[PDB]
Design a protein around this ligand. Sequence first.
Ligand SMILES: O=C(O)C[C@H](NC(=O)CP(=O)(O)O)C(=O)O
Ligand SMILES: O=C(O)C[C@H](NC(=O)CP(=O)(O)O)C(=O)O
Ligand SMILES: O=C(O)C[C@H](NC(=O)CP(=O)(O)O)C(=O)O
Ligand SMILES: [Ca+2]
Ligand SMILES: [Ca+2]
Lengths: 310, 308, 308
Amino acid sequence: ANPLYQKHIISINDLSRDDLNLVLATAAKLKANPQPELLKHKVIASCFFEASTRTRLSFETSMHRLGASVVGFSDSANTSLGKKGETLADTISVISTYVDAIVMRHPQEGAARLATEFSGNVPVLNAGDGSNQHPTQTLLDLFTIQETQGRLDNLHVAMVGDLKYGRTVHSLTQALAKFDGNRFYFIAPDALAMPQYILDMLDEKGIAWSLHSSIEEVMAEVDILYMTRVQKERLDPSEYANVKAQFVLRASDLHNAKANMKVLHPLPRVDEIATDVDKTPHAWYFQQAGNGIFARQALLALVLNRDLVL
Amino acid sequence: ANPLYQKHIISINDLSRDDLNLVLATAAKLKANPQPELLKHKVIASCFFEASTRTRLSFETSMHRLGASVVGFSDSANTSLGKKGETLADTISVISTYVDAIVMRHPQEGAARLATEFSGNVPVLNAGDGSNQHPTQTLLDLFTIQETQGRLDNLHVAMVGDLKYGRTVHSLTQALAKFDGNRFYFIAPDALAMPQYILDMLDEKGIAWSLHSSIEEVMAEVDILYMTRVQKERLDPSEYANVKAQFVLRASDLHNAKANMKVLHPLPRVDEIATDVDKTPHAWYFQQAGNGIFARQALLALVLNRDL
Amino acid sequence: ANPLYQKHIISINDLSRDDLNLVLATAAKLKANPQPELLKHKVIASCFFEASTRTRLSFETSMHRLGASVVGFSDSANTSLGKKGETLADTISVISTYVDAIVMRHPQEGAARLATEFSGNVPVLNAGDGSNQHPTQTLLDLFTIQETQGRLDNLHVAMVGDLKYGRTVHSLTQALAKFDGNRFYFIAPDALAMPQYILDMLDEKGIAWSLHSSIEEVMAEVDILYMTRVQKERLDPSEYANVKAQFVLRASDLHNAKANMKVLHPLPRVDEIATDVDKTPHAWYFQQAGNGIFARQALLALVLNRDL
Ligand SMILES: O=C(O)C[C@H](NC(=O)CP(=O)(O)O)C(=O)O
Ligand SMILES: O=C(O)C[C@H](NC(=O)CP(=O)(O)O)C(=O)O
Ligand SMILES: O=C(O)C[C@H](NC(=O)CP(=O)(O)O)C(=O)O
Ligand SMILES: [Ca+2]
Ligand SMILES: [Ca+2]
C-alpha cells in the first residue's frame, strides 16, 4: 500500500527514511517516463501568502504535467482575507470544499499545521511556513545529492549563511540525519547559527558536526557545499547588522575542492555566490532547481493516487 | 427546451420560478453524476474588479470540473484599463473576441448590465455588482435550503445584519418571493434596513414580513436563519458608527431552535457568528459554500450548451 | 522541421518575407480548421513585467485553444525578483528548466534579447521590450491587412501618432518594407517622429515615404489608417506637453475614404479615435484584436511543432 496516500506533508520530522526513499524512487520513474493523465479529474489549490518564483511555478507546472487543473492566488491582497477581515481558518474551511489538495506557503511559523485542523479530509502540503520547515525543498535537494554523489549516506555536507532562519536547512539536516554516517560543517555568523533543537537531535543520534569561521578551512573535505541567502525579511531589529552575506564564494575559492563536489543553493542568491562560479563544473544550483519538477510531481502522485506506480 | 441557453444572467428579477427550478434540478444530477468533458473546447473569462475568495475560486473550479479553460484577472491593476487609461467598454469589446462567456464581479451597481451592451453574442454572468445583485449566490442558497428543508415554499426565514448593502439578500428575497407562502423576519440596525423596493415587492405579492430587534425573539419559529456581514467597504462615512456587528449569534442561542433549522451565511463572517456555533448540528455555512460548485456547474452547462 | 521550429522571436528585423508568409498561411489554416490537441503536453510560461490586457489574454487563450497549459505572472511584485532581490538573469535561468517556451513582456528595451542568453534551448517570444519591438502585434496586424485588403503589396499605409516610442510601428514598418510596392505616410508631432534608423532602412530599399501634417491630406488615398496612443509611460516629463493626442479621428473625417479603407489601432486608445467612429464600416480595431487569436496560435504551433 502507499504510505503517503491522503497524508498531510508538513514537516520532515514526520517522515521516515523509507518515506523519503519512496518519493525519490517515484521521482526517478516519472523523470524517465511521464504520466500525463495520472491526475486527470483532480483540481488543486495553490495558495501563496508570501513571495515565490521557483516553488510556486514548479509546483503548478508539475500539476499540469500530471493532467491536473489549478486554482489559487500568489498574493492575499484581493482575497476575502485580504480585504474583508476573514480568518485563515475560515479560508481553509471553504477552499477544502472545492479541491483535492491544498499547497500553501505562509509567513507565520506553524501556519501549515494550523490549516490541517480545518481542511477535513483534504491533504495540506507545506510550501514553507515562516522560518520553520520547507519539506518539498528537501525532497528536491535529496534527489539532487543522490544524483551527483550516487548515495545519501556517508557524506560530508557544509551548510553556510543564515542557518537560524533557513527553513531549507532545518528540513535538510533533519532528513540527512535519518540516513547513516553523514557529517555536518556549519558556517554561520554567531547571530544566525543553527538552532539548538537541531543540534540536540544530532547529538541524540550520534552524528558528527562542527562550527567554522571560514569556508576555506573545510573546503577539501566536502562533497556538498550548501549556500544560503540571509533571510532579510525575517530578521529581528537586533539582527539588522547581519543583513549582508558574511561568506562570499568565488571561482578562485574552488582550487582545493574535490572533483565530485557540488555547490547547491535553494535560491534566490544575493551576492553569496559570485557569477564567475556559474561556469565551473561544481555549480549545480540551476540543475537543482530543475529537479523540483520531478520531486513535486512524485509528491503529488503519492498523495493523490491510491496505488503506487509500478 | 433549454430556455437559459445563451442568456445573460444579471438579476434574479429577470428569471422565473421555472428557470430557478431547472438550474436546481440540473445541479442535483451533476452532483450525482459528473460530466467532466461537458464544456471541453470552451474558454471562459473570469474578470474580478473587487475582492473574492469563494465566488472566484468556486467558479474556476466548476469550469475545470466540466473540462473548460479559464483566463482573466483577480484585480484590474495590471490591465490596460489599470495603467494605460482604457475604458471598461473597450475592455469588454476585446475580451469578447476571445472567450465563450464572461464571469464578472465589479464594485459599481449596474456594471454587469453595462457589459452586455458591448459583449455581442457572448453571455455575461454577474458575480456581484456593487450592493445590487448576486444571482449565483442565490442559486446556491436555494439549492441548500431545498436540500435541508425539502421544499422552497411555506418557510419561515430570518435575515440578519446589513440588509441595505447586502447584494445577497436582495437577490435571495426576490427569489424566495417567487415561491408560495414564505414568511420573512428582518433583524437589522436602523441605518441598514432592507430597502423599500424589496418591501414594496413583497407587499404587492401579499407576502408577510416583520421587523425585529433581536435574533432570540424569532428563534423558535424559523426554518432558516440567514446571517450577514456589515458591508464595511460600501458604507457612507455618515454610517461609520455601524461597522461593528450589531447582532451576534452564539451556540447557546440555538437552545430552542427547531430540529430542522439551519444557520446560513454567504461568508465571509467577522464576529456575527461565534466559532462555538461551528460544531453544532445547525451550522451549515460551510456545506452551503460547497454547494456553490454544483449550482455554478449547472448554470455554466445551461448557458453554454443548446440541449439539456 | 519548419523554418521557425525552436527559434527565438525577438525582432521583425530577424524575420524574412517567407517566414512571415508561413505564419499567415498557418493562421488561415488554423482559423478554418482548429486542432485542439496540437500542443497537448506543452507547458508555456507567461511572464509579464508591465501591464497588458490584449497581448497576455489572447496569448493564454491561444495556448488553451491548442491544448497547452500556462504558468507565470502578470506582475513581478510577488516573485523572488520582486521581494528577495533576484536578478532577471537568474529568473530566466530557473524558469527555463520548467517550460517548453517563454513569452515575455518587459519595460526595458533589449530585455527579451538578454533572456535568450540565459534560456538555453528554450525559445523566447518577445511580447514587447520597452519602446523597441513588438513582433506578435505585427503578425496579427499583417493578418488583418491581408484579410481586409486581399494582399500585402501595392498598398498606401498611413501611421499616425507617437511613432518615436511606439514599438508597434517600428515592427510593422520593418515588416511591410519586406513586401512590394508599398508607400508610407507618417503623421506625428515633431517631438515624437519616426526614428531615423527606420527611415534609413526604407531609403536603402528604395521605398517611398513622406511626412504629413494632417489626416485630411491623405484620407483620399489610404488603404490602411494605423492610429496609435501617445506612450505616456515612456516619455520624459519635459515632453509632457505632447501627452494630448495631436490628431483626433472622427466619423466626419471619413467622407472621402476609399470603400476598402480600414482604421486600425493596436489598442488601447485614449482620445485619438472618437467613439462615433466605432459604428462605421471603416472601424476594424476590435476585429484586428480578435485576429490575435489566429496569429498567436500559428506562431506557437510553428515554434513548438516540428512538422507543419
Ligand atoms: O528564500 C530563500 O532564500 C530560500 C527558499 N527559496 C525558495 O523556496 C525558492 P522561491 O522563494 O523562489 O520559491 C525559501 O525559503 O523560500
Ligand atoms: O461579502 C459578503 O459579505 C457577501 C458576499 N460574499 C461572497 O460572495 C463570498 P466572496 O467574496 O469570497 O466571493 C458578497 O456579496 O460578496
Ligand atoms: O500600448 C500601446 O499603445 C500599443 C501596444 N498595445 C498592446 O500590445 C495591447 P495590450 O497592452 O493590451 O497587450 C503596446 O505596445 O503595448
Ligand atoms: Ca439589476
Ligand atoms: Ca504579390
